[PDB]
Amino acid sequence: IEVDMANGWRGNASGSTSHSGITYSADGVTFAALGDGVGAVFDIARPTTLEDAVIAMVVNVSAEFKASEANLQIFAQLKEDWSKGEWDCLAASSELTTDLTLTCTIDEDDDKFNQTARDVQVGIQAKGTPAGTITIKSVTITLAYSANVDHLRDLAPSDFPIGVAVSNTDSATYNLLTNSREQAVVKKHFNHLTAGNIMKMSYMQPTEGNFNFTNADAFVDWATENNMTVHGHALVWHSDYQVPNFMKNWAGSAEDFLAALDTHITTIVDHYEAKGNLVSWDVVNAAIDDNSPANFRTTDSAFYVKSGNSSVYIERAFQTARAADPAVILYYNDYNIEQNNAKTTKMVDMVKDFQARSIPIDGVGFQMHVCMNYPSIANISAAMKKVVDLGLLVKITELDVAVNQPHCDAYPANKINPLTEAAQLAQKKRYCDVVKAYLDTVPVNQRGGISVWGTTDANTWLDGLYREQFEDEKISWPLLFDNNYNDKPALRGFADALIGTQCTNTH
Ligand SMILES: O[C@@H]1[C@@H](O)[C@H](O[C@@H]2CO[C@@H](O[C@@H]3CO[C@@H](O[C@@H]4CO[C@@H](O)[C@H](O)[C@H]4O)[C@H](O)[C@H]3O)[C@H](O)[C@H]2O)OC[C@H]1O
Ligand SMILES: O[C@@H]1[C@@H](O)[C@H](O[C@@H]2CO[C@@H](O[C@@H]3CO[C@@H](O[C@@H]4CO[C@@H](O)[C@H](O)[C@H]4O)[C@H](O)[C@H]3O)[C@H](O)[C@H]2O)OC[C@H]1O
């Protein structure tokens, strides 16, 4: 709460000496400190949840007030219940001179400031034998749950990994290796990791024949130290920000381009085989378009264009990855293929073609970037079953569940902001439904794992993707842990599914 400094302020006398009101300017709110108990205040409407809230004021006091040796008391009290309040803050003349920052934590014995009955009067007053003036420049007021899950990974009903995507050197704030809160949540709940960006193409090979393994190797070493396996992401992907410059600008033949693509794959696969912890790769990521009917991408993919207007690079990537390490599990990975419409159909036809022509492929990764109420559990189940029936592994690679999403629930007509308890419980049921559909649809020996695309809501990729539609607000809140790394009901819902407990949006 940033308190308005231009409206809503009042003089106050909490003692016998009368006050002389308040004065507005460009510097803030000013009053004369006429006697003991004389101050300035504003109101907060009922109901209030103000226990453990922190009041911070920037103030500025006159020479005469300094000379008076008077103290300053930040306080709050209930209107019509005047005797009840927070009276234990005091800034003594000692500490005063400049704009100072004075704070007051609202901390009461009986929880009196979590209440429904009265409005709340908040302010600052002089104590002692005061004189001169006080100026307040600004006021800010900084206002748990447990899922009771000890280790999420330990609840899987068969042997499949429970995994998470982490940030690395691509984020100063959220880098797994420098952020001890990220390390803690990961070590507590997961046994499987994906790098969010640093194993993508231009990160691994920024120029032709100069590979850069240093940062990704430190990530793999930390996974090994902590008894976790690594899913490699990704050997081939069209997204412009991570295509190596020399590939974007290829000026030679189609056969020479495909040979350079082979070198990229063989070098990276051989290196991570020898490092000793790399169990599966997304070999080709998101190569099908978003049209209906669906086709492989054309002009928006450097790989289609530089291969000579051909999708042959897809099968070649799989053949090359297999030759480099025959033991590593090979996935095709994509979004929207869980919807059971045009894109699902194109993916299934591609797998059938590959099986007919002896092109190696071990599984399909369903990224599973879903909305709260779309697509349906029936459609998600039917789409995964199409892959199960071809004898392949099914892996959920990038699960998140958006509370607001511009393509769902007629956004923004029903926008949820701020986040509510009802929305958190809806998210609990939704994570339960999706994980249960996976277990119900995919036989034990075809379960490639379930991973979520991030740790805390404070760093989800969705808020950046939809920044324009969201008006720069962080409103997708799509993951298992909140902005302070505490549990959300979402985590209880994931756990309920693993243990076979009914999926609900209740407590
Ligand atoms: O250290 C604590 C003491 O400060 C504390 O004294 C209390 C201070 O607050 C007092 O409440 C006064 C009551 O008058 C209010 O103004 C009235 C608002 O309504 C108008 O209709 C009316 O005309 C005004 O006069 C004022 O806002 C408010 O500060 C309270 O009565 C004192 O008990 O005691 C506890 C110590 O720990
Ligand atoms: O020089 C800096 C640039 O490098 C930097 O680039 C940004 C890097 O982050 C990018 O966002 C990435 C995009 O990929 C996300 O994961 C994908 C989600 O969709 C799935 O289909 C796919 O499989 C996943 O790989 C990832 O979470 C997210 O962090 C962003 O788009 C780039 O612009 O910009 C800052 C410069 O200083």
Provide the descriptors you would attach to this structure in a database record.
disulfide bond; monomer; 2 domains; five-stranded antiparallel sheet; eight-stranded parallel β-barrel; 507 residues; xylan degradation; binds a molecule of 4 linked components (XYP-XYP-XYP-XYP); Jelly Rolls; signal; carbohydrate metabolism; alpha/beta; TIM Barrel
Major sheet strand order: 13-14-15-16-17-18-20-21
How many structural domains are formed by the residues?
2
Ligand set: a molecule of 4 linked components (XYP-XYP-XYP-XYP)
CATH level 1 name of the largest domain:
Alpha Beta
Pathway: Glycan degradation; xylan degradation
Protein name: Endo-beta-1,4-xylanase Xyn10C
Subcellular location: Cell outer membrane
Family: Belongs to the glycosyl hydrolase 10 (cellulase F) family.
